[PDB]
From a paper:
pmcAcetyl-coenzyme A carboxylases (ACCs) are crucial for fatty acid metabolism, facilitating the conversion of acetyl-CoA to malonyl-CoA, an essential step in fatty acid synthesis. In eukaryotes, ACCs are large, multidomain enzymes consisting of biotin carboxylase (BC), biotin carboxyl carrier protein (BCCP), and carboxyltransferase (CT) domains. The BC domain initiates the reaction by carboxylating the biotin group attached to BCCP, while the CT domain transfers the activated carboxyl group to acetyl-CoA, completing the conversion to malonyl-CoA. Mammals possess two ACC members: ACC1 in the cytosol of liver and adipose tissues and ACC2 associated with the mitochondrial outer membrane in the heart and muscle, whereas insects and other invertebrates have only one ACC gene.
Using cryo-EM on ACC isolated from a T. ni cell line, we obtained a 3.12 Å density map revealing the CT details. However, the 3.12 Å resolution cryo-EM density map revealed only the CT domain in high resolution and the CD domain in low resolution, with the other domains being invisible, likely due to the intrinsic dynamics and metastability of these domains in T. ni ACC. The solved ACC CT domain is full length, spanning from amino acid 1622 to 2396, with approximately 175 Å in diameter. CT forms a head-to-tail dimer, where the N domain of one monomer interacts with the C domain of the other. Both the N and C domains extensively interact with each other and with the ones from different protomers mainly by hydrophobic interactions and salt bridges. Additionally, when comparing the buried interface area among different species, single-cell organisms tend to have a lower buried interface, while human ACC CT exhibits the highest buried interface, with T. ni ACC CT nearly as extensive as the human ACC CT. We superimposed their structures onto our unbound CT structure and found that the interacting residues are largely conserved in T. ni ACC CT, with a few mutations that did not significantly change the pocket polarity. Our results show that the majority of the structure is largely conserved; however, the C terminus of the C domain (residues 2180–2230) in T. ni has elongated alpha helices. Additionally, we found that the CD domain of T. ni interacts with CT at a different angle, deviating approximately 45° counterclockwise from the angle in T. thermophila and around 30° clockwise from the angle in H. sapiens.
Numbering used by the authors:
A (entry chain A), B (entry chain B): 1622 to 2199, 2215 to 2396
The structure:
Amino acid sequence: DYLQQKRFLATSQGTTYVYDIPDMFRQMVERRWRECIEEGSVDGPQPDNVMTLVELVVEPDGERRVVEVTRLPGQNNVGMVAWRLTLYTPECPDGRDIVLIANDLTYYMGSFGPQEDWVYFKASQYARELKIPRIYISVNSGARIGVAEEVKSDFNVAWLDAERPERGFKYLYLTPEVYSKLGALGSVKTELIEDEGESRYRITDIIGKEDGLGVECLRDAGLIAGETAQAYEDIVTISIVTCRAIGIGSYIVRLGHRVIQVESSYIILTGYAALNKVLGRAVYASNNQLGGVQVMHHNGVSHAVAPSDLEAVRTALRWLAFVPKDKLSTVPILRVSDPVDRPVEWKPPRAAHDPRLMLAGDAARAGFFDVGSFDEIMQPWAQTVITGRARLGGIPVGVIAVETRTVELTQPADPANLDSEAKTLQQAGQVWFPDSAYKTAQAINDFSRENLPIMIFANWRGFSGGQKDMYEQILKFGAEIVRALRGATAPVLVYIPPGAELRGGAWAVVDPSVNSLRMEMYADPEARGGVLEAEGIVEVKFKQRDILKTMHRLDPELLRTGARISELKEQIKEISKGAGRAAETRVRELETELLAAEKTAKAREKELSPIYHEIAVQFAELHDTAERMLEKGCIFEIIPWRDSRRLFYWRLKRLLRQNEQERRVQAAVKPADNMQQGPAAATLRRWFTEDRGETQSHQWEHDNEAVCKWLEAQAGDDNSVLERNLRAIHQDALMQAVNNLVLELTPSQRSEFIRKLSAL
Amino acid sequence: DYLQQKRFLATSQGTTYVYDIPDMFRQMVERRWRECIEEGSVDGPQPDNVMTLVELVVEPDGERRVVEVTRLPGQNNVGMVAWRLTLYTPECPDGRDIVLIANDLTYYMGSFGPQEDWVYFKASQYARELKIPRIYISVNSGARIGVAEEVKSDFNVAWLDAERPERGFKYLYLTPEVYSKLGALGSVKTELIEDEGESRYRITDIIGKEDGLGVECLRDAGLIAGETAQAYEDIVTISIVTCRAIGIGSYIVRLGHRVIQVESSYIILTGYAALNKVLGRAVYASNNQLGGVQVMHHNGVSHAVAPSDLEAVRTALRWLAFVPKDKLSTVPILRVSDPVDRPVEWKPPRAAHDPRLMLAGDAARAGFFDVGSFDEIMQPWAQTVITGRARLGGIPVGVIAVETRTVELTQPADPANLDSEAKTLQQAGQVWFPDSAYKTAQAINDFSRENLPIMIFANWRGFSGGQKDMYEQILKFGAEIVRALRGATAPVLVYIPPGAELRGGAWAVVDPSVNSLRMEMYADPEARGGVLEAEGIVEVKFKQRDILKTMHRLDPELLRTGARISELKEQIKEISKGAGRAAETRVRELETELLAAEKTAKAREKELSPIYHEIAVQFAELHDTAERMLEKGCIFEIIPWRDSRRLFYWRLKRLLRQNEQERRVQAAVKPADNMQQGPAAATLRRWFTEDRGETQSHQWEHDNEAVCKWLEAQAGDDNSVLERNLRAIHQDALMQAVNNLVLELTPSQRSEFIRKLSAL
């Protein structure tokens, strides 16, 4: 046979056979080596063996423990196969372990039954307790459906009239000789009824000697769902869909939250035939309408799409290259193929542009990140926000940016409703919508679970606040970004690019004060920020009376006319009296000339309105500049666009090394005190001032290169200041802990403790 | 004055003045006493003082610490007032503390300036560090906007031509004598430019000597947002909106997650005039269209709506009556007014009905919960799922139920788009939709933060799987119920009512195996559950061949006709040969009568098709019953509907006592070992078997009443088994901890420890 029929069935339905899955990983690892050899991320020759596989088999009955074996392919007795893989990758050359779980389409169409479910449970438990990432490939038909067959070949029917069966039947019963066979196995729950002239066993309930018929599959489905949620919280989970995912398997896919879909796949819950039976007419013609690429890639369930299974393996290893090898380690930092001292020569223009060109480049005018390092995940969903992963100097970075072009969104028709039609929606550039805000929160959550540093490029003028968007819950998804930023496990760096604006509640969302431990903000010299735009501040705070006062203060003709009116009023006050009323007549003339004075001082106040309106707008715009943001303390430092790469590289590297040593200091003090981040940073600063001196102690804040090189120097040596002081601090913490717990003891136990431990 | 003008301004705009806010709580507490005296939940007379208020004032400059004072009303220098209130409620008669935060409309329209932000920050920190609930009242105009006024008074312009100002201006500048006055205060960043014949100071930037003008309010707004998110995770937060909530305040409202809205309120992000200025025409005529009750109560941001501020205070204290007084205490259990031994006489019918009637009653045929205890929160949003709070025997319970009637949903028109029209959508009864699933997840989260027991009434046939609901992210909101059930902090009891079905992936969502520590499942005798409905299992697993085999096995005419065809086949086999071919003539007649035999055995197989289809449907329906679910282990016990109240009361009380004593056992061991729930329950069972006996040890599982009375008996006495063994295990844990932390020490340090203890 040599596994030919299983391969034929899997290839005919469109799936790589399960025991041919690991070798694909091997090939892609080899390809990465060759590409890195062309780029210079690694320089060594490719190793002879790049993958070592050990198969995990669960014990059947004792305690269902996981036993690692090496055996020939094709010997499975259940519907999933799991391996542990050691991969010798360019980013991790010594070794790196993952756990791979895959279904079997040759075994009952990949259905979910209990013995299949315990394999997933124990493999995900193994991946969680070893803290290594998990990759699941889904080829499934859903939960297992079954009908008991020993009763099916033996049940009898109680008729109203035996001559005419078409009228109806009363109950389903078993004869006594059938019950003599089936009574021991516990397949039926029955009642002894003497109807007509014979003893009959009326079937009340049907049970099976076999398992997997009914709700016992759905009991372990919730076990998989809870374990997949727990694995999402505790490790990095990647899911691949190749042919189909029906029902509960789809939920496991969404409980992975990182989904790669082949172009011929579908992720559905209810099949199209059942929906046409419910709706009564042939509404749907395929399951690709319900759950294909054009639905799941455009709503955000499927992150990336791949043409084949091998390309999906390549995308999975690309995503795995960014994350650390386990939860106790630092992110994989490659070598510097692209110089960090190079200029960033693609400047973001004021007009509408493509933000991916400022991150990658346009075959000249090189951009921010490394050449070719950029990978974006949810492209056709919520295209206002661009979310992806890249590398800066070899350091993995999560990237969020804002498209400044209008987005046309086509909402397709619903074929269940005849009146429904497709619609075109125009979405503005720099505005969070419900989908864009939910995308941003999802991206921050997914980068926070993998401990990836996030750099956000901030260009927002606010939220959407129209009636349709207020009905579509903009407040909820706006709050989810605040919660996601609050649950950050990595440094977050917000940077305002040239020509970008950060206004309104968007500043309140992305401010460093949401999570002060993990967030910083920087701005370009040509960056604007404020509560409102300039026209709104002119409407609310610099109104018509101020404009007219400005005209009477700075216009020469209005000054001279006002002086004329004042002298006329003095001429009124001096000439109070006036034969009788002889001096009256000139007063009348003066009144007309005073009407020539107040008028034509109104013609100047209407001719000069737009120019002092532009003075108002300029005066409002001078409050929005970067130097006021630096002086008020809202931003940390002003970084130019041309020198952004080097400075952010050294700052990110300094924060990574500093956070690692702060975790070591908090680990050392654990018996005595629960130490926060600030005392740990102060302790490292005190060791820095002890090692260097009081003259060079300012460089802890200013120089981000000297601190990082100092940390990498002091971490290696065991005669260093840092390691010796960590050992001394740990011993003092042990002393304080033992002192407290011996003061908490009783006088009776204390004497036993002293005499037994002084007896030695 | 006696605060008359401030009350006039607040009452004219429609808001209760801030120093009249506490007294309302007083009145409502008094009302509750009278109502409870009529019901019998309390018996004692009403206390003389039911509320004690102490005002919290932040220090201005030293460390911004909270100082508690008692002073005359009307002396605020900031726009927020905060108090700590001791309330002597019927559920908590001894005392109960909350923290109340309220804005001031009389102080700059309730705007958010930095000092107000620090009052909110420090008051919420006080509420979190005392672990007591927080109530906030939102009367706000948003973030504070400002313009520097000295530069506004004294700026000058540089003209292209001074004779004609209308052509344009070059820059905004200051004269030297103005710069001599304003140089020391740091209001301008300028450059010395000699243009024309005079020295000029070209204003590059404008800064203010005052604060609150710009982005610093947006900086402290993120501080409020992060603290409000943290307070949502750590304590219970309730928010009330009375006149308006604009901008960041709205987000704080959503970060409370429990919202009471007055009928004249609005919760908006952008005003109507700004949206009409963007859209260019008069689209909106009010802010009630963007943020009123008809939007927020129908999308789910506003939980409850109240006609006035007094009724909102009543609703807030109603919600506060369910939750415990602090995070270290057990839920308030009132006295038994309605007897727990009464029958539940409103049976849920098979037809479409109102699920509120089985929970409350219909002025006869009393329902499940207490009479009048039911309070539902989100009524007009996602009306498939009914979510609320009630009381069982005095115990607070969170309630989730399923409406079995078709819901008409009216989607209103969008005034921005001219082609938009209103739509009517029909939603089925027993199906999770995106809004219904998101409502269920929100309800489980809000009940889990308050440590309230949840009882779920499970009647679902699955999820919605059409193309429109797949595009509207059904999987995303279906996974959130699994995550919310996984993050449960309280006992969860799922019960299938009579006449209810739990089918498909809904069972996988609400199974006990998602969170086995906190979830249980029970079912009525007349309850159905399965993977699919019976017709689908007939399509998949009882097809045409099995039906025809059943006809040939159980129908008499087919049995006789098959025997006839068999005998004619034997007559074919015997007559092989056949003057020549003399016996061939009977073979033709046999062929005709064999064709007459095979036909009319096909007429019987088409006449009998519907009746054996009903036999197939009945045989499939017999697998879905309750006793199969009990025998397979999926449900815990079968509980009838008439006796559900007593049994669920005693089980819930047993779990509530047992979890508290398990937490005491895990607290006792904590120096030595981190103990899970299972060893704690086993330890309590071993103490139970030690006290009672080896014979009466089954009652730990069967009799909940005996376990309740045993735990409540030995919680009080200090000579009991439980208290003595807790002290013994704590002392042994201390001894083991000291032994281990001495064995981790160095030899030189150990000798100093020995001599310092032996010196005593």
